[PDB]
Write an enzyme that holds these catalytic residues in place. Structure first.
Site, PDB file in Angstrom:
ATOM      1  N   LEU A  39       0.804  -1.219   0.000  1.00 33.80           N
ATOM      2  CA  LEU A  39       0.000   0.000   0.000  1.00 33.80           C
ATOM      3  C   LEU A  39       0.841   1.276   0.000  1.00 33.80           C
ATOM      4  O   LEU A  39       0.307   2.346  -0.290  1.00 33.80           O
ATOM      5  CB  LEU A  39      -0.912   0.010   1.240  1.00 33.80           C
ATOM      6  CG  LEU A  39      -1.885  -1.161   1.437  1.00 33.80           C
ATOM      7  CD1 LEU A  39      -2.542  -1.120   2.827  1.00 33.80           C
ATOM      8  CD2 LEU A  39      -2.931  -1.174   0.344  1.00 33.80           C
ATOM      9  N   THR A  41       5.366   2.770   0.188  1.00 32.49           N
ATOM     10  CA  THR A  41       6.774   2.414   0.305  1.00 32.49           C
ATOM     11  C   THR A  41       7.608   3.676   0.441  1.00 32.49           C
ATOM     12  O   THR A  41       7.310   4.692  -0.189  1.00 32.49           O
ATOM     13  CB  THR A  41       7.221   1.583  -0.911  1.00 32.49           C
ATOM     14  OG1 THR A  41       8.459   0.904  -0.634  1.00 32.49           O
ATOM     15  CG2 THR A  41       7.368   2.471  -2.140  1.00 32.49           C
ATOM     16  N   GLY A  42       8.658   3.587   1.253  1.00 31.06           N
ATOM     17  CA  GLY A  42       9.543   4.703   1.525  1.00 31.06           C
ATOM     18  C   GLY A  42      10.989   4.257   1.642  1.00 31.06           C
ATOM     19  O   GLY A  42      11.340   3.134   1.264  1.00 31.06           O
ATOM     20  N   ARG A  46       7.761   0.092   4.533  1.00 28.82           N
ATOM     21  CA  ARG A  46       6.645  -0.128   3.639  1.00 28.82           C
ATOM     22  C   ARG A  46       5.409  -0.340   4.490  1.00 28.82           C
ATOM     23  O   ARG A  46       5.511  -0.669   5.672  1.00 28.82           O
ATOM     24  CB  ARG A  46       6.817  -1.436   2.866  1.00 28.82           C
ATOM     25  CG  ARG A  46       7.894  -1.510   1.915  1.00 28.82           C
ATOM     26  CD  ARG A  46       7.936  -2.923   1.438  1.00 28.82           C
ATOM     27  NE  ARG A  46       8.787  -3.776   2.263  1.00 28.82           N
ATOM     28  CZ  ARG A  46       9.114  -5.026   1.958  1.00 28.82           C
ATOM     29  NH1 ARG A  46       8.609  -5.584   0.870  1.00 28.82           N
ATOM     30  NH2 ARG A  46       9.962  -5.698   2.734  1.00 28.82           N
ATOM     31  N   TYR A 112      -6.703  -1.577   9.244  1.00 33.66           N
ATOM     32  CA  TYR A 112      -6.688  -1.159   7.832  1.00 33.66           C
ATOM     33  C   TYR A 112      -7.892  -0.285   7.547  1.00 33.66           C
ATOM     34  O   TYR A 112      -9.028  -0.720   7.748  1.00 33.66           O
ATOM     35  CB  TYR A 112      -6.705  -2.370   6.900  1.00 33.66           C
ATOM     36  CG  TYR A 112      -6.839  -2.016   5.440  1.00 33.66           C
ATOM     37  CD1 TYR A 112      -5.996  -1.114   4.847  1.00 33.66           C
ATOM     38  CD2 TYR A 112      -7.845  -2.578   4.667  1.00 33.66           C
ATOM     39  CE1 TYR A 112      -6.123  -0.779   3.497  1.00 33.66           C
ATOM     40  CE2 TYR A 112      -7.993  -2.230   3.309  1.00 33.66           C
ATOM     41  CZ  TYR A 112      -7.119  -1.339   2.738  1.00 33.66           C
ATOM     42  OH  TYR A 112      -7.217  -0.934   1.422  1.00 33.66           O
ATOM     43  N   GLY A 115     -10.699   3.499   3.023  1.00 34.96           N
ATOM     44  CA  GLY A 115     -11.195   4.612   2.237  1.00 34.96           C
ATOM     45  C   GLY A 115     -10.171   5.434   1.518  1.00 34.96           C
ATOM     46  O   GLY A 115     -10.562   6.298   0.729  1.00 34.96           O
ATOM     47  N   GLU A 117      -6.371   7.885   1.432  1.00 36.58           N
ATOM     48  CA  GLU A 117      -5.857   9.120   1.989  1.00 36.58           C
ATOM     49  C   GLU A 117      -6.741  10.291   1.637  1.00 36.58           C
ATOM     50  O   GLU A 117      -7.244  10.385   0.512  1.00 36.58           O
ATOM     51  CB  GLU A 117      -4.502   9.440   1.348  1.00 36.58           C
ATOM     52  CG  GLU A 117      -3.420   8.456   1.672  1.00 36.58           C
ATOM     53  CD  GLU A 117      -2.107   8.718   0.938  1.00 36.58           C
ATOM     54  OE1 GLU A 117      -1.985   9.732   0.209  1.00 36.58           O
ATOM     55  OE2 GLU A 117      -1.180   7.919   1.127  1.00 36.58           O
ATOM     56  N   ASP A 156       3.683  15.535  11.960  1.00 39.36           N
ATOM     57  CA  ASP A 156       3.615  15.092  10.571  1.00 39.36           C
ATOM     58  C   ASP A 156       2.233  15.312   9.985  1.00 39.36           C
ATOM     59  O   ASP A 156       1.789  14.538   9.131  1.00 39.36           O
ATOM     60  CB  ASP A 156       4.045  13.628  10.397  1.00 39.36           C
ATOM     61  CG  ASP A 156       4.647  13.328   9.021  1.00 39.36           C
ATOM     62  OD1 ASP A 156       4.762  12.135   8.697  1.00 39.36           O
ATOM     63  OD2 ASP A 156       5.018  14.272   8.295  1.00 39.36           O
ATOM     64  N   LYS A 158      -0.332  16.305   7.462  1.00 37.71           N
ATOM     65  CA  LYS A 158      -0.387  16.517   6.019  1.00 37.71           C
ATOM     66  C   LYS A 158      -1.507  15.631   5.486  1.00 37.71           C
ATOM     67  O   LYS A 158      -1.856  14.656   6.125  1.00 37.71           O
ATOM     68  CB  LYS A 158       0.950  16.171   5.337  1.00 37.71           C
ATOM     69  CG  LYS A 158       1.448  14.756   5.563  1.00 37.71           C
ATOM     70  CD  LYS A 158       2.791  14.519   4.891  1.00 37.71           C
ATOM     71  CE  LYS A 158       3.302  13.107   5.101  1.00 37.71           C
ATOM     72  NZ  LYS A 158       4.592  12.931   4.391  1.00 37.71           N
ATOM     73  N   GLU A 160      -1.740  13.323   3.302  1.00 40.13           N
ATOM     74  CA  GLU A 160      -1.455  11.903   3.067  1.00 40.13           C
ATOM     75  C   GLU A 160      -1.564  11.066   4.329  1.00 40.13           C
ATOM     76  O   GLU A 160      -1.701   9.844   4.237  1.00 40.13           O
ATOM     77  CB  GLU A 160      -0.038  11.729   2.491  1.00 40.13           C
ATOM     78  CG  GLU A 160       0.200  12.353   1.105  1.00 40.13           C
ATOM     79  CD  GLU A 160       0.635  13.834   1.127  1.00 40.13           C
ATOM     80  OE1 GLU A 160       0.380  14.601   2.099  1.00 40.13           O
ATOM     81  OE2 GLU A 160       1.237  14.239   0.110  1.00 40.13           O
ATOM     82  N   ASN A 161      -1.479  11.682   5.505  1.00 42.46           N
ATOM     83  CA  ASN A 161      -1.507  10.944   6.757  1.00 42.46           C
ATOM     84  C   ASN A 161      -2.893  10.842   7.371  1.00 42.46           C
ATOM     85  O   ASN A 161      -3.033  10.306   8.476  1.00 42.46           O
ATOM     86  CB  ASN A 161      -0.514  11.540   7.755  1.00 42.46           C
ATOM     87  CG  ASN A 161       0.899  11.158   7.433  1.00 42.46           C
ATOM     88  OD1 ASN A 161       1.146  10.278   6.586  1.00 42.46           O
ATOM     89  ND2 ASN A 161       1.833  11.763   8.125  1.00 42.46           N
ATOM     90  N   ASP A 174       0.624   7.254  10.771  1.00 40.04           N
ATOM     91  CA  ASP A 174       2.028   7.595  10.679  1.00 40.04           C
ATOM     92  C   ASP A 174       2.441   8.459  11.860  1.00 40.04           C
ATOM     93  O   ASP A 174       2.367   9.687  11.833  1.00 40.04           O
ATOM     94  CB  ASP A 174       2.450   8.191   9.343  1.00 40.04           C
ATOM     95  CG  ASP A 174       3.958   8.155   9.162  1.00 40.04           C
ATOM     96  OD1 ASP A 174       4.459   8.341   8.032  1.00 40.04           O
ATOM     97  OD2 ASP A 174       4.654   7.954  10.162  1.00 40.04           O
ATOM     98  N   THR A 191       7.119  17.432   6.344  1.00 38.30           N
ATOM     99  CA  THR A 191       7.198  17.759   4.931  1.00 38.30           C
ATOM    100  C   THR A 191       7.326  19.272   4.766  1.00 38.30           C
ATOM    101  O   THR A 191       6.737  20.040   5.536  1.00 38.30           O
ATOM    102  CB  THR A 191       6.014  17.174   4.126  1.00 38.30           C
ATOM    103  OG1 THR A 191       6.308  17.195   2.722  1.00 38.30           O
ATOM    104  CG2 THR A 191       4.725  17.912   4.395  1.00 38.30           C
TER     105      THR A 191
HETATM  106  O1  LIG Z   1       0.639   3.056   9.353  1.00 40.54           O
HETATM  107  C1  LIG Z   1       0.460   3.660   8.289  1.00 40.54           C
HETATM  108  N1  LIG Z   1      -0.688   3.606   7.559  1.00 40.54           N
HETATM  109  C2  LIG Z   1      -1.907   2.908   7.800  1.00 40.54           C
HETATM  110  C3  LIG Z   1      -2.351   2.665   9.067  1.00 40.54           C
HETATM  111  C4  LIG Z   1      -3.603   2.115   9.277  1.00 40.54           C
HETATM  112  C5  LIG Z   1      -4.428   1.807   8.244  1.00 40.54           C
HETATM  113  C6  LIG Z   1      -3.999   1.995   6.924  1.00 40.54           C
HETATM  114  N2  LIG Z   1      -4.855   1.665   5.920  1.00 40.54           N
HETATM  115  C7  LIG Z   1      -4.428   1.845   4.681  1.00 40.54           C
HETATM  116  C8  LIG Z   1      -3.178   2.346   4.344  1.00 40.54           C
HETATM  117  C9  LIG Z   1      -2.324   2.699   5.338  1.00 40.54           C
HETATM  118  C10 LIG Z   1      -2.712   2.538   6.680  1.00 40.54           C
HETATM  119  C11 LIG Z   1       1.543   4.513   7.712  1.00 40.54           C
HETATM  120  C12 LIG Z   1       1.520   4.985   6.408  1.00 40.54           C
HETATM  121  C13 LIG Z   1       2.603   5.679   5.908  1.00 40.54           C
HETATM  122  C14 LIG Z   1       3.688   5.878   6.736  1.00 40.54           C
HETATM  123  N3  LIG Z   1       3.740   5.439   7.999  1.00 40.54           N
HETATM  124  C15 LIG Z   1       2.675   4.783   8.467  1.00 40.54           C
END
Ligand SMILES: O=C(Nc1cccc2ncccc12)c1cccnc1
EC number: 2.7.11.11
Length: 340
Positions: A39, A41-42, A46, A112, A115, A117, A156, A158, A160-161, A174, A191
């Site tokens: 879903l 990657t950095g 990931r 998870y 829906g 970002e 953090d 933003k 995307e989070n 995040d 960012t």
């Molecule tokens: O933990 C993270 N994300 C998520 C947590 C819970 C649900 C997610 N559902 C879908 C997609 C990501 C999800 C995350 C993403 C990017 C960087 N560091 C952390």
């Protein structure tokens, strides 16, 4: 503040501290899960969609490569992220369900949120109306009220989070830069478009940086682009520190007034950092229609429900090369990550 809020936050802090002082550890293992899809990657990790083989539940599993965490100087940050996440509890924070480590990696197994970002939805529609932006902003205000009362800075914020859940509410994900801070902290992180001036200027900064970032977020939600936009970071930073912001004519006067007080360069004059704390924000005219309790209780109908088919649907996330989850036969970086 109403004794009601005081007593709520006192209990929240008690419960956080108990878990903070005695963190959970080693609550699952990798072979309890099937891998479904990458879903995100950095540079050191990931996020994978996985399914628990016994319960059938789906999770977002954040996998951090210990060697890369060390190389990129993220050790303390990754320890912060997990220790904080296992201790917090709030409606708008993604829940950590399990954590563990192995010879190569650290794992945080989160709920998870299918829906997608906020970022995707914002870019697809262009901009949110003020009521739509306000619904999300109110959730962030309450989340920061909670976090800051625990002496946590998020660092953090933003689009995307901020994930959109099955009810259309926000889940913050995040916690890689989150930290427990009484007083000041100094690390350069975040960012570019969202950094407060005092971060850019290398000062000892505090929770006021989160309130600045909220101003950036609200502006970006309502305009469709961030307030200090430029092509390269150095030019962004010059705009941030300047004390000048231009508002679209479609912004309401109330919105502009709130944003001037959040995007206040002088941190000692910034809303969220004054004697009245978060109440200067909660009581601002732009929030006059917001029922804070109803938002907290998730009783307000959301602006939209994301389209998805079920708890395993990945349509609202994007496609990445699928790489191995290799686990070395030899333990890496054991000392650095003892507490994880
Ligand atoms: O933990 C993270 N994300 C998520 C947590 C819970 C649900 C997610 N559902 C879908 C997609 C990501 C999800 C995350 C993403 C990017 C960087 N560091 C952390």
């Amino acid at each position: 503040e109403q004794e009601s809020v005081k007593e709520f936050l006192a209990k929240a802090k008690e419960e956080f501290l108990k878990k903070w002082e005695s963190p959970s550890q080693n609550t699952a293992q990798l072979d309890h899960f099937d891998r479904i899809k990458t879903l995100g990657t950095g540079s050191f990790g990931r996020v994978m969609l996985v399914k628990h083989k016994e319960t059938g539940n789906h999770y977002a599993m954040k996998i951090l490569d210990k060697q890369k965490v060390v190389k990129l100087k993220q050790i303390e940050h990754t320890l912060n992220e997990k220790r904080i996440l296992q201790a917090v509890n709030f409606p708008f924070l993604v829940k950590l369900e399990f954590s563990f480590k192995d010879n190569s990696n650290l794992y945080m197994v989160m709920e998870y949120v299918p829906g997608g970002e906020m970022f995707s939805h914002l870019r697809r529609i262009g901009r949110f109306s003020e009521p739509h932006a306000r619904f999300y902003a109110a959730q962030i205000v309450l989340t920061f009220e909670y976090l800051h009362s625990l002496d946590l800075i998020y660092r953090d914020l933003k689009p995307e989070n901020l994930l959109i859940d099955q009810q259309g509410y926000i889940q913050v994900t995040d916690f890689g830069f989150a930290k427990r801070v009484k007083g000041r902290t100094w690390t350069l992180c975040g960012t570019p478009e969202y950094l407060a001036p005092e971060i850019i200027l290398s000062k000892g900064y505090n929770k006021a940086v989160d309130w600045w970032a909220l101003g950036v977020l609200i502006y970006e939600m309502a305009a469709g682009y961030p307030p200090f936009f430029a092509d390269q970071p150095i030019q962004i930073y010059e705009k941030i520190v300047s004390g000048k912001v231009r508002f679209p004519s479609h912004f309401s006067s109330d919105l502009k007034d709130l944003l001037r007080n959040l995007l206040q360069v002088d941190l000692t004059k910034r809303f969220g950092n004054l004697k009245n704390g978060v109440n200067d924000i909660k009581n601002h005219k732009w929030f006059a229609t917001t029922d804070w309790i109803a938002i907290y209780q998730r009783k307000v109908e959301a602006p939209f429900i994301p389209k998805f088919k079920g708890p395993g649907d990945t349509s609202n996330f994007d496609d990445y090369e699928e790489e191995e989850i290799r686990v070395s036969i030899n333990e890496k970086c054991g000392k650095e990550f003892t507490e994880f």
